[PDB]
Amino acid sequence: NFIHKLKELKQKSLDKFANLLYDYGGYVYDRPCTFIICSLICCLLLTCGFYFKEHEKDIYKLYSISNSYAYETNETINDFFYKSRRCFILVESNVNLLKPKILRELQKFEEGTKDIEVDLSEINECKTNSELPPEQSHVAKELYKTLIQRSEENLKSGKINGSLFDYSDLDENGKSNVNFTDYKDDVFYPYQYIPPMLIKADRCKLQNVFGDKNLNIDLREASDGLKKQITYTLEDICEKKYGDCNFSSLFLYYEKGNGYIDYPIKVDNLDFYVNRRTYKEMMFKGILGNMVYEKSGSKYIIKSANAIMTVIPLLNSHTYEPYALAYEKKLIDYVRFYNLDDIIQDEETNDDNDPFIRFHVFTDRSLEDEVDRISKIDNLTRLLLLIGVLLIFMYALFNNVTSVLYRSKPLCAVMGIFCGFLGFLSGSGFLYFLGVKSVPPAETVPFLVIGVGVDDVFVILNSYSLLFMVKDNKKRIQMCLKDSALAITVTTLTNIIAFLISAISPFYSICAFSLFTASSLFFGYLMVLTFLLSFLCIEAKLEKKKRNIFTGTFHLFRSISIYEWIHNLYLFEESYIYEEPKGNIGKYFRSLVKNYYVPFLSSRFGKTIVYIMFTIIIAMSIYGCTLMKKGIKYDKAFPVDSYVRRFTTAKIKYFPDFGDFIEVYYFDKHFINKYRGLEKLYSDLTDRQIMNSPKINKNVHWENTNLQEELINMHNTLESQEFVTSVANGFTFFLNKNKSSLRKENPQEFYEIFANWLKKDFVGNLFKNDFVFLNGKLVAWRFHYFQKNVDDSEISSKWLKACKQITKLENHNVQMVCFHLSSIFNETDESIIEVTLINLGITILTILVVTAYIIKGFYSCVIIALIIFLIDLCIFGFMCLCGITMNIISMVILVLSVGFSIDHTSHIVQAFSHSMGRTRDEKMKESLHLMIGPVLHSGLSTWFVISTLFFSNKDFTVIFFQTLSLVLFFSITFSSMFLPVLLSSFGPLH
Numbered sequence: 001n002f003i004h005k006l007k008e009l010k011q012k013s014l015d016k017f018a019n020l021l022y023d024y025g026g027y028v029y030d031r032p033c034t035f036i037i038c039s040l041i042c043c044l045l046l047t048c049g050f051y052f053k054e055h056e057k058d059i060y061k062l063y064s065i066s067n068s069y070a071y072e073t074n075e076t077i078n079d080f081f082y083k084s085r086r087c088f089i090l091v092e093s094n095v096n097l098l099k100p101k102i103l104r105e106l107q108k109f110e111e112g113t114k115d116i117e118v119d120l121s122e123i124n125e126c127k128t129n130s131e132l133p134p135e136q137s138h139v140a141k142e143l144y145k146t147l148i149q150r151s152e153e154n155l156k157s158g159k160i161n162g163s164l165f166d167y168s169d170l171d172e173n174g175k176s177n178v179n180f181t182d183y184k185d186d187v188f189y190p191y192q193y194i195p196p197m198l199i200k201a202d203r204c205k206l207q208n209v210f211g212d213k214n215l216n217i218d219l220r221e222a223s224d225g226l227k228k229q230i231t232y233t234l235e236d237i238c239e240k241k242y243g244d245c246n247f248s249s250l251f252l253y254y255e256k257g258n259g260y261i262d263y264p265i266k267v268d269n270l271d272f273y274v275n276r277r278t279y280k281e282m283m284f285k286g287i288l289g290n291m292v293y294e295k296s297g298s299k300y301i302i303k304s305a306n307a308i309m310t311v312i313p314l315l316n317s318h319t320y321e322p323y324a325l326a327y328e329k330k331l332i333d334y335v336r337f338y339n340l341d342d343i344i345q346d347e348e349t350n351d352d353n354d355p356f357i358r359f360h361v362f363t364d365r366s367l368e369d370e371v372d373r374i375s376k377i378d379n380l381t382r383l384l385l386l387i388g389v390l391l392i393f394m395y396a397l398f399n400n401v402t403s404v405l406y407r408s409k410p411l412c413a414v415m416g417i418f419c420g421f422l423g424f425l426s427g428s429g430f431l432y433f434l435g436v437k438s439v440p441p442a443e444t445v446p447f448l449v450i451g452v453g454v455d456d457v458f459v460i461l462n463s464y465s466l467l468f469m470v471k472d473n474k475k476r477i478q479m480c481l482k483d484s485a486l487a488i489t490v491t492t493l494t495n496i497i498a499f500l501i502s503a504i505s506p507f508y509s510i511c512a513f514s515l516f517t518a519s520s521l522f523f524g525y526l527m528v529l530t531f532l533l534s535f536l537c538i539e540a541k542l543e544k545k546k547r548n549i550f551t552g553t554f555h556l557f558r559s560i561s562i563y564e565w566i567h568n569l570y571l572f573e574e575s576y577i578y579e580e581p582k583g584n585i586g587k588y589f590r591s592l593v594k595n596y597y598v599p600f601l602s603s604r605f606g607k608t609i610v611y612i613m614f615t616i617i618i619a620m621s622i623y624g625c626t627l628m629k630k631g632i633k634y635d636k637a638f639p640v641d642s643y644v645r646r647f648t649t650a651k652i653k654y655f656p657d658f659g660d661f662i663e664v665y666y667f668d669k670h671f672i673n674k675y676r677g678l679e680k681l682y683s684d685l686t687d688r689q690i691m692n693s694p695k696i697n698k699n700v701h702w703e704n705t706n707l708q709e710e711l712i713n714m715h716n717t718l719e720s721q722e723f724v725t726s727v728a729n730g731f732t733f734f735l736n737k738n739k740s741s742l743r744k745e746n747p748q749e750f751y752e753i754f755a756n757w758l759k760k761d762f763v764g765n766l767f768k769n770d771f772v773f774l775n776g777k778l779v780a781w782r783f784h785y786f787q788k789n790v791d792d793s794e795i796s797s798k799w800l801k802a803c804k805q806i807t808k809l810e811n812h813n814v815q816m817v818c819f820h821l822s823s824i825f826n827e828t829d830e831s832i833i834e835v836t837l838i839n840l841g842i843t844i845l846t847i848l849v850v851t852a853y854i855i856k857g858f859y860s861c862v863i864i865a866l867i868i869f870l871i872d873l874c875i876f877g878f879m880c881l882c883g884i885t886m887n888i889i890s891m892v893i894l895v896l897s898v899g900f901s902i903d904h905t906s907h908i909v910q911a912f913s914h915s916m917g918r919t920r921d922e923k924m925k926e927s928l929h930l931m932i933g934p935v936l937h938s939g940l941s942t943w944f945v946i947s948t949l950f951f952s953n954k955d956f957t958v959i960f961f962q963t964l965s966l967v968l969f970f971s972i973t974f975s976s977m978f979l980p981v982l983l984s985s986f987g988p989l990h
């Protein structure tokens with residue numbers, strides 16, 4: 001019942017679709033020019049949507065997951081801690097930079113950095129046309145006023161008395177829409193600390209940012225010239241150290257006459273030196289690079305150093321967000337354009353090359369700026385696209401031009417390339433009309449689309465090449481379209497399905513890439529059906545009139561089943577319609593396949609050769625699967641010549657120890673929840689469930705001696721790690737300095753002693769900015785440590801996880817969050833495996849269902865599934881073997897590999913099934929002779945368009961090219977060599 005009825009319905013539907021396409025081709029043949037002009041007009045109207053093109057530049061949006069826990073941690077850190085923007089300025093040289101002349105020049109360079117002036121007209125965030133002051137909640141404003149008043153009063157008083165605070169454990173709700181009464185009695189230590197989330201002042205008023213300048217200007221209500229008159233310098237937005245700017249540079253040694261530039265520098269400690277005159281700290285390890293010293297006379301005498309680093313701290317608050325964002329920009333223009341080669345020319349080098357001195361810069365603005373620059377498509381990508389288009393045009397012309405000119409189809413190939421390009425343009429325009437923003441990966445959308453947009457073309461030509469016997473050109477075109485309609489529709493539908501399923505991934509970059517590719521493929525399919533088919537009709541009319549393109553242009557200026565046919569041909573071979581005419585489209589290639597390749601495959605020697613070769617390939621794939629690596633470094637997304645990558649390379653070169661600045665934070669859950677109230681498919685929610693335990697980070701007694709000893713042991717363990725070079729933990733210093741005083745374990749005593757140590761001690765004065773006390777209880781704190789830089793992301797993620805394990809203190813319900821910039825990318829690399837393993841399964845199931853709906857028989861579907869699984873296994877094994885890691889690009893291409901390879905596999909299998917040969921060998925011969933041309937062409941075209949990406953300056957594009965080339969190579973080999981042999985051996989017969 002079910003088997004009969006479902007198969008009957010399927011066959012009836014397929015036959016009706018074929019007849020509909022037959023009649024559609026018949027209708028198109030009468031109106032080719034009308035279809036051409038209408039399709040072109042529609043494509044241009046859709047392309048007009050490029051005027052609404054937008055780029056997505058947020059790194060979190062592009063690369064992070066939707067519910068990334070790193071995003072939540074960054075939000076918490078910014079809401080409750082005072083971070084400072086850090087501008088790094090590095091200077092490299094094959095010449096030692098410690099000579100007095102170069103030192104004087106670099107001092108002038110630093111003074112120039114200090115002397116940069118920015119006018120208020122450059123503050124793009126105050127343009128008199130924005131709603132920049134959103135409404136802050138009323139209770140928050142009242143609390144901010146009360147807290148600033150209390151901070152002023154406490155700072156004036158300068159007394160620490162924890163006798164009035166309540167030290168009892170908080171309730172589950174935090175007790176001993178939010179009411180101001182609960183918040184109005186909060187006392188914060190240090191007294192100048194107020195939660196940065198509460199500092200929401202009018203950013204466009206100069207009084208809120210520059211009190212000293214005494215100007216009362218509303219930038220949203222000020223003219224452009226009036227704002228341009230007023231200027232500010234570095235000193236107005238720079239973090240202060242004893243009043244002066246808190247510069248971290250070599251020239252702190254010479255400050256206030258402590259040392260002299262001409263004389264050699266002598267320092268009593270190469271790790272932490274305090275300038276006696278200025279009382280300012282300085283770490284020579286972080287400043288100087290390839291440092292060479294003497295260590296004589298109980299001190300260290302530094303002779304040479306081939307690198308110098310300077311760190312400029314800028315205030316990082318809401319009100320100071322734009323101004324710094326302005327100054328940093330100018331700072332970059334001051335560094336990337338600075339030249340001091342004149343002095344360098346004379347001095348002796350290290351590498352014996354021409355002497356050199358290069359300045360590098362890195363800011364928090366730099367990554368966003370580089371992403372913005374990358375978002376626009378560069379000239380190199382356009383040149384590569386042009387070269388790929390030229391290659392595919394040459395290949396198509398070479399295949400479709402033969403000895404006889406009027407039987408050739410060059411115009412069809414050219415218009416097929418044009419159909420691919422127009423489909424890409426129309427799809428991109430439609431999605432821009434829908435509002436989807438263009439991610440940088442979309443730069444690779446054109447190539448791929450063209451690489452697919454030609455495939456259907458070849459298939460149609462194949463059918464039109466096989467129907468030379470039909471004298472009626474209109475009926476010939478109708479039958480050609482009838483034969484090729486199911487194949488073309490299934491191919492495009494499968495590609496669209498694969499890309500749409502890929503678009504489900506949480507990362508917006510992949511979602512946009514897949515959406516653009518799917519829309520472009522759909523519109524390219526429509527263009528193939530109309531624009532290309534009309535040109536096919538025109539060239540068929542010219543062929544019937546026996547005039548080629550040139551003669552036709554001159555005159556215009558003057559003015560039966562194919563399987564049955566191949567079976568009959570092979571039966572006649574056992575001894576007008578059987579023999580192709582001279583100069584046919586695919587005569588020579590089919591002759592080569594039938595005369596040489598088919599006898600090789602049918603021979604026993606060919607079969608055993610193929611079996612041995614593919615056994616070796618599968619074994620190599622398994623061994624590669626054994627060598628599996630995961631993760632890609634983020635900077636690979638940028639070109640090597642970008643100043644960010646150059647700065648990173650240099651830093652790694654001259655400063656191996658100071659690789660990553662990992663920051664470890666502890667937040668009290670009750671405090672965080674109390675102060676947050678003022679603001680008002682994929683289950684890989686990693687690093688979130690652990691931190692949400694009901695009994696963690698709540699009312700932790702820091703006065704406990706056991707907990708302090710555990711903290712000391714944790715610090716020692718963190719120092720013991722090989723990948724950790726230095727640790728800056730103020731809590732450890734406090735505990736080491738004071739042990740007898742803390743024996744009482746009294747919470748009030750602990751609070752008072754910690755406050756006094758922070759307020760009075762020199763090291764405490766340094767660490768004052770890393771601790772938050774509310775109502776006499778330490779509610780949040782932090783420390784930092786440096787991690788060796790490594791080129792492998794997987795080992796870096798392992799180090800971060802080891803650090804998270806070390807910071808865990810389950811005995812006292814304490815776990816500290818470890819954070820870094822690379823944490824987001826590590827989270828993405830950890831989630832990509834699960835995301836891909838889900839998407840691949842969903843894609844495979846859907847594609848198998850779709851192909852089983854169209855493939856005749858059930859055993860053929862099993863063969864197709866086995867071939868698809870083997871192709872995927874080989875692709876993954878060789879991508880692991882070739883050093884490609886399991887990253888976003890490789891995983892997405894692995895997902896799409898099913899949709900790409902199913903086309904060739906289905907072509908060969910359906911050609912085998914529909915044939916009427918008696919033995920398996922005859923059916924294999926017919927299947928090859930019919931559909932080995934299109935299968936080879938549809939892969940060679942895609943690879944020819946893609947190959948130009950091998951020279952792309954962006955490593956992500958290179959990985960894309962490599963993985964796609966592996967996919968295409970394995971699909972072609974398993975569809976043209978392994979599949980025919982497998983069908984000859986065990987293929988179905990009835």
Ligand SMILES: CC(C)CCC[C@@H](C)[C@H]1CC[C@H]2[C@@H]3CC=C4C[C@@H](O)CC[C@]4(C)[C@H]3CC[C@]12C
Pocket residue numbers: 272281727728763766767784
């Ligand atoms: C002389 C002995 C007894 C004490 C000196 C200890 C040294 C190694 C410690 C104490 C103070 C520490 C600094 C305190 C604060 C900061 C700011 C932070 O953004 C980076 C780390 C940095 C710069 C720390 C580096 C290490 C440091 C300099």
Ligand SMILES: CCN(CC)S(=O)(=O)c1ccc(-c2csc(Nc3ccc(C)c(C)c3)n2)cc1
Pocket residue numbers: 058059062063371374440441444509513634635637638888889892954955956957960
């Ligand atoms: C550092 C901040 N970034 C995180 C890496 S990012 O802004 O999100 C970012 C991400 C990627 C690129 C990029 C350039 S070329 C490129 N080819 C590419 C081609 C095809 C596919 C499927 C993919 C994924 C990529 N992709 C550029 C920037």
Ligand SMILES: *[C@@H]1O[C@H](CO)[C@@H](O)[C@H](O)[C@H]1NC(C)=O
Pocket residue numbers: 160161162163164
């Ligand atoms: C703290 O305040 C209480 C309440 O007035 C007072 O009794 C105590 O002496 C104060 N402690 C100090 C050190 O001033």
Ligand SMILES: *[C@@H]1O[C@H](CO)[C@@H](O)[C@H](O)[C@H]1NC(C)=O
Pocket residue numbers: 177178179
């Ligand atoms: C504000 O008032 C009550 C009484 O003090 C307080 O307990 C509660 O937090 C608030 N009431 C609400 C939210 O209904």
